[PDB]
Design a binder for this molecule. Structure first.
Ligand code: MG
Ligand code: MG
Lengths: 354, 354
């Protein structure tokens, strides 16, 4: 079932907040911005989501982060243009810091909390058995990815004490968290066949896993990241995932087993609550490594791969971020301790995107 | 180790709501009520929890639903008198229809939520391999237990659209849901040794699974039901659960396997969202049976077990419930569609408890 990709190919989706410049709440009509924009587009796709306070931008299939980065700018330039003209703003962030409130029948008040904004990264694979191996490998660094990209400390007017609270709002859905264990593509096809016997699942797109394979695009999509405040930070996470994927498939450093996932949810929570401060627990021995120490280990491990792919810039910047500093949620909170308001925080994010 | 128990013994825990009679919000001062009641007990305990809007009442080790009924009647006569003379009222339901509000370091805004009320039922086992087997059998019927006992359609003044919304507020904890697979008691001690390598867990009380073996008490505890509106419905559920444990251990319907749990979370969502109207899906054949229909199968199957244990009155009352309508949450909505107010709802609920 698996479309064949040039291995290590890259694709980025970004879910973008649309703002309203007086009071800076979430906009009501982004289908007027999106319809203004499409005409003037050269590279990429801009898509309509459901609540009309979101603007998805996506690259095409990219051969490295330079191509990705410049497709992102070609969309940004056009977006920021038509935004001025409709007196609107655009920013990232995993949540909007203060906005309050047929898929409605199925899920009720679960889809009536914060509307929520993520970055997805696609990586190309040769055959699909590789895709499953890669998925398992990338699942070991889901905490790392989350903590490098956390950008959602504020929900519904208040500090949640989480670096990433965005992911919490998906947790009562039956399909949340890690993909159930399969060992190869034959078994994955078996899993999807059985899951789809339910009323709730008709397609691959209906399964909101942390990491899921796309048969159609020939990829593995990692979906845990909050939409970041800036294009550089998005590109840096894309490079890390590309580079990590290359390390895994090339050097094959793991022999993945079902018992690896045992503490998946405990480690994933640690990265959401705290950040790079979160504590990782090994399933088998119980040895615990601080998240920050362990992402330095990861950035070291994937440096050779990043050089071959043209993504050394990205893991150079991430190493800076970890060694002295933190995620974009940490810095949102320093802004507030300087007597800033939440109305002014969102405004500074609209500007920072540029 | 697994304390040896007389097979099919019964424990009932009931978390009750303590109410403030003018405006019918939850009271904050329910431990002065408890301390008036403790001395006058001839059988069973009463406790406080972290907020003092809850009153835990637990039977001791009982031998049938008649012994359980008797102690719960005896505790209740004494609490109805201690609350009457003390300006407070008592009711059930898994959620308060409109209440708003050290460990808030660990979980933040997640425990700063609606405080929720549940009924737990322990069933005793001889060896601790029978517990693992019993747990896997009851897991098949979690959807049914929830659908039958659902009593939490309103949160924060609004209709969630769910039968049981109480179970959603736990979904963000990494340990929510089903216990990860083990095939026997030796494997279960391995599982627990590994889960406890984390900061977040030291004892068994810390793991908030739907069904959970208690080695100390020598039981399997099912933990998914909302506190019902009356003691009779509480007892009928205990009766069904004990009859079901007997049928399972005695006739061994199932050869349990990890792949049996594939659709577990999809099926329990259906029970939470819809009533007995939820549809249950078989992991192997993809067969869809409506939940009201499958609860009648479960009722017929455990009829011989229930008769033997003196709980045949409970499965007679539940067959009635399944045939002529549905759960307490449904009848909560009918009171509001009739012209009722949410304050009147809680007041009616204090009256039904007597
Ligand atoms: Mg995507
Ligand atoms: Mg309990």
């Amino acid at each position: 079932d698996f479309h064949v990709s040039e291995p290590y190919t890259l694709g980025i989706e970004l879910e973008m907040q649309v703002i309203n410049p007086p009071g800076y709440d979430l906009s009501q009509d982004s289908s007027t911005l999106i319809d203004a924009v499409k005409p003037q587009l050269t590279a990429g796709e801009i898509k309509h989501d459901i609540t009309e306070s979101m603007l998805e931008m996506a690259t095409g299939v990219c051969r490295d982060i330079d191509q990705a980065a410049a497709q992102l700018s070609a969309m940004q330039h056009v977006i920021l243009q038509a935004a001025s003209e409709h007196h609107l703003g655009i920013c990232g962030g995993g949540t909007h810091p203060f906005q309050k409130w047929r898929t409605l029948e199925n899920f009720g008040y679960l889809i009536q909390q914060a509307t929520v904004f993520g970055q997805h990264v696609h990586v190309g694979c040769a055959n699909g058995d590789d895709a499953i191996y890669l998925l398992h490998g990338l699942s070991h660094f889901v905490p790392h990815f989350i903590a490098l990209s956390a950008a959602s400390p504020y929900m519904q007017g208040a500090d949640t004490r989480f670096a990433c609270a965005r992911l919490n709002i998906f947790s009562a859905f039956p399909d949340n968290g890690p993909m159930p264990w399969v060992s190869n593509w034959q078994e994955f096809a078996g899993l999807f066949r059985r899951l789809s016997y339910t009323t709730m699942i008709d397609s691959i797109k209906d399964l909101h896993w942390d990491i899921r394979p796309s048969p159609a695009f020939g990829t593995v999509e990692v979906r845990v990241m909050d939409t970041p405040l800036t294009l550089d930070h998005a590109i840096n996470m894309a490079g890390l995932i590309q580079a990590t994927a290359h390390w895994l498939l090339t050097e094959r450093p793991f022999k993945p087993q079902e018992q690896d996932y045992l503490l998946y949810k405990f480690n994933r929570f640690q990265a959401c609550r705290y950040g790079l401060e979160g504590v990782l627990t090994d399933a088998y021995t119980g040895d615990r490594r601080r998240l920050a120490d362990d992402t330095l280990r990861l950035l070291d491990n994937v440096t050779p791969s990043a050089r071959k792919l043209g993504a050394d810039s990205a893991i150079d910047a991430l190493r800076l971020q970890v060694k002295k500093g933190g995620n974009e949620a940490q810095y949102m909170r320093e802004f507030i301790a300087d007597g800033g308001s939440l109305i002014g925080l969102v405004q500074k994010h609209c500007e920072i995107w540029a």
